[PDB]
Amino acid sequence: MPQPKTFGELKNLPLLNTDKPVQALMKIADELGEIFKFEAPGRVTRYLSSQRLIKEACDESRFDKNLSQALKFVRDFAGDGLVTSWTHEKNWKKAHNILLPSFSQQAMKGYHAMMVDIAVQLVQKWERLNADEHIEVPEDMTRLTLDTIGLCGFNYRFNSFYRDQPHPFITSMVRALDEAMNKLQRANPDDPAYDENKRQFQEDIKVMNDLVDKIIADRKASGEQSDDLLTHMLNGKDPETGEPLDDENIRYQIITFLIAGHEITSGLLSFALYFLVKNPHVLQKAAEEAARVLVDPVPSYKQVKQLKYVGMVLNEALRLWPTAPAFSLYAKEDTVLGGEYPLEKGDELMVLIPQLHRDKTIWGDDVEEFRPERFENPSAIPQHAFKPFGNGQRACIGQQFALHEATLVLGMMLKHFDFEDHTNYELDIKETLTLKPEGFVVKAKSKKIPL
Ligand code: HEM
Ligand SMILES: O=C(CCCCn1ccnc1)N[C@@H](Cc1ccccc1)C(=O)O
């Protein structure tokens, strides 16, 4: 099988010692094709980029979720929360079973009011900008998505629109995520040069644990019965085991949700708005839908469901720049991938989602183009062609949450503002564990529609 250039004993590892590893891997996939082996010291994985192979990798009878090295490092603070759990860990299925009703379309109806609360704050923020002011899009999207998950997750107001300095939890979570990402490119991770990084990581873990544990303890102590994820986790019983999540796992779930609803979800909005302002006809069609559907000062859940084209904009943004750009699988047994590449039990696969989503055999030669209309009919999209939310039982539990939040907010943004790519912004995708259009800025001229 193909493999990119190697650096002696470091194998391919230095290829990921780059500011933009996902984009680096995409370029490697561009050159090497649908599958390449990627070796690092004591690690081998295969990056899959074609729907042809990924549809097989998505076969849960043959492949299970693997914790990528990145997820393994995030597990140091997301614990056995859902995204850093192995499927075979008791706490995975337990939490999966308990949390699924909390994340369904039907649950979104109950989160909707809280999402609107934050979305209106975003609108009001942009409504209150002065004429020459501009919007730092990823920053504001993250304010929105963090606040939304804080409010819907555990009735906690990060009040991100009231600050420029991040919440202590977010400082530690961002710095812990950064430490996880840095631990990946390190050729010598045991070197004492990183000893302070390891110590800071420990301090960041303890910070996140303490603040979330206190959030949990505070909720148990107040006895308050909100309808947020925290309440469901405190009160939920896994139908299978009959057991609730323990407080430790609930903390990990909360940390996981905060990670996920932070820049992973804000990236979706950031990229969506990026593609909208880069595609005025798409923007206009999306804004026309927003105006036609969002006839009330506050969007209802039902109206957000009616933002079909906005939904397609988000999918198309997810297609081009999936904010969770890769997921790892391992072969449950010896198997043959694509009739060509024999895998041994335990062999790892990486699904390079942005490259999958550029599979010209699926999307046509207009792959780079932002055409939300690609998603008019999900039935017309081949199986496993579109995997921004991962796969199978290990798919994104937050998908409905992310999409509802994004659709609501994008709908309101499109209703309330005309957007100007006033700097003719050059897409620069900053890579952390997610992707964001770094420095993406717009001007939003209010249509002066009241809320
Ligand atoms: C646009 C936004 C989002 C995207 C693109 C996204 C993407 C993904 C992907 C690709 C996976 C699979 C990871 C893997 O297989 O290793 C995943 C899993 C997961 N996501 Fe998301 N996510 C988003 C937002 C959210 C939100 C808002 C939440 C919760 C508040 C969330 C919670 C989770 C959880 C708990 C899992 C693990 C589910 C399980 O394995 O049982 N995500 N997500
Ligand atoms: O696999 C992940 C981790 C992304 C996890 C997405 N996600 C899901 C839920 N929450 C987040 N990165 C990819 C790409 C990469 C490589 C080196 C450094 C950074 C990134 C890989 O390791 O090859």
Which residue type sits at 451?
L
Q: Which residues, including other chains, have CB under 8 Å from residue 302's CB and lie 6 or more apart?
A: none
Q: Residue 394 C-alpha to ligand 2 middle, in angstroms?
A: 15
Pick the ligand that lies closest to the CA of residue 314.
Answer: 1
Q: Is 194 annotated as a binding residue?
A: no
Residue 123 beta carbon below 6 angstroms from any ligand 2 atom: no
Residue 21 beta carbon below 6 angstroms from any ligand 2 atom: yes
Q: Which residues, including other chains, have CB under 8 Å from residue 327's CB and lie 6 or more apart?
A: 65, 68, 350, 351, 353, 387, 390, 391, 394
Q: Residue 387 C-alpha to ligand 2 middle, in angstroms?
A: 14
- Residue 326, Cβ neighbours under 10 Å: how many? 24
Experimental technique used to determine this entry: X-ray
**CA 154 vs CA 111, 212, 214, 227, 377: distances in Å:** 11, 10, 12, 8, 35
**DSSP 8-state code for residue 60:** T
Q: How far apart are CA 230 and CA 258, in angstroms?
A: 12
Q: How far apart are CA 1 and CA 355, in angstroms?
A: 18
The distance between the two most distant Cα atoms of the chain, rounded to a whole number of Å, is 63
Smallest Cα–Cα separation from 16: which of 329, 427, 433?
433
Q: How far apart are CA 60 and CA 329, in angstroms?
A: 9
> Residue 196, class by beta-carbon neighbours within 10 Å (0-12 exposed, 13-18 middle, 19+ buried)?
exposed
Q: How many CA atoms lie within 13 A of 342 on its CB side?
A: 2
Residue 114 beta carbon below 6 angstroms from any ligand 2 atom: no
- Residue 345, Cβ neighbours under 10 Å: how many? 10
* Contact between residue 410 and residue 416 where contact means Cβ atoms under 8 Å apart: no
Q: Residue 184 C-alpha to ligand 1 middle, in angstroms?
A: 20
* Contact between residue 381 and residue 318 where contact means Cβ atoms under 8 Å apart: no
The radius of gyration of the chain from alpha carbons, rounded to an integer in Å, stands at 21
Q: Which residues, including other chains, have CB under 8 Å from residue 295's CB and lie 6 or more apart?
A: 303
Q: Residue 125 C-alpha to ligand 1 middle, in angstroms?
A: 28
Q: How far apart are CA 397 and CA 383, in angstroms?
A: 19
**CA 401 vs CA 35, 43, 237, 264: distances in Å:** 32, 34, 21, 12
- Residue 258, Cβ neighbours under 10 Å: how many? 24
For residue 305, the Cα-to-chain-centroid distance in whole angstroms is 21
For residue 399, the Cα-to-chain-centroid distance in whole angstroms is 9
Q: How far apart are CA 344 and CA 336, in angstroms?
A: 8
Phi, psi of 136 (to 5 degrees): -90, 100
Phi, psi of 421 (to 5 degrees): -80, 70
* Contact between residue 247 and residue 237 where contact means Cβ atoms under 8 Å apart: no
List beta partners, residue 327.
Answer: 351
Q: Residue 132 C-alpha to ligand 1 middle, in angstroms?
A: 37
Residue 13 beta carbon below 6 angstroms from any ligand 2 atom: no
3 state DSSP class of 79? coil
Q: How far apart are CA 398 and CA 249, in angstroms?
A: 17
Q: Residue 82 C-alpha to ligand 1 middle, in angstroms?
A: 9
**DSSP 8-state code for residue 375:** G
* Nearest atom in ligand 2 to 47's CA: 23
Please report where in the chains the tokens 């990581």 appear, as a residue. 201
| DSSP notation for 326-361 | EEEEEESSSEEETTTEEE-TT-EEEEEHHHHTT-HH
Q: How far apart are CA 326 and CA 63, in angstroms?
A: 15
**CA 5 vs CA 44, 45, 118, 317: distances in Å:** 14, 15, 47, 31
Which residue type sits at 269?
L
Q: How far apart are CA 214 and CA 202, in angstroms?
A: 18
* Nearest atom in ligand 1 to 153's CA: 30
Q: Where are the alpha helices (DSSP H) in 223-331?
A: 229-235, 247-259, 265-278, 280-293, 301-305, 308-320
* Contact between residue 233 and residue 99 where contact means Cβ atoms under 8 Å apart: yes
Smallest Cα–Cα separation from 276: which of 164, 390, 73, 135?
135
Query: Of all protein residues, whose CA lies closest to atom 42 belonging to ligand 1?
Result: 398
Q: Where are the alpha helices (DSSP H) in 100-246?
A: 105-127, 137-154, 168-185, 195-222, 229-235
Q: How far apart are CA 386 and CA 359, in angstroms?
A: 10
Q: Residue 321 C-alpha to ligand 1 middle, in angstroms?
A: 15
Query: Of all protein residues, whose CA lies closest to atom 43 belonging to ligand 1?
Result: 396
* Nearest atom in ligand 2 to 16's CA: 17
Token code pair at residue 382: 């081949």
**DSSP 8-state code for residue 262:** I
* Contact between residue 13 and residue 38 where contact means Cβ atoms under 8 Å apart: no
Q: How far apart are CA 53 and CA 353, in angstroms?
A: 12
Breaks (C-N over 2.5 A) in the chain follow: none
Q: Which residues, including other chains, have CB under 8 Å from residue 278's CB and lie 6 or more apart?
A: 370, 421, 427
Residues in the chain: 451
Residue 83 beta carbon below 6 angstroms from any ligand 2 atom: yes
Q: Is 111 annotated as a binding residue?
A: no
Q: Which residues, including other chains, have CB under 8 Å from residue 56's CB and lie 6 or more apart?
A: 62, 63, 337, 338
Please report where in the chains the tokens 């250039």 appear, as a residue. 5
Our mutation pick for probing the ligand 2 site, out of 16, 76, 182, counting the most ligand atoms within 8 A of Cβ, is 16
Which residue type sits at 97?
N
Q: How far apart are CA 198 and CA 181, in angstroms?
A: 13
For residue 428, the Cα-to-chain-centroid distance in whole angstroms is 18
Which residue type sits at 130?
N
* Nearest atom in ligand 1 to 83's CA: 37
**DSSP 8-state code for residue 48:** E
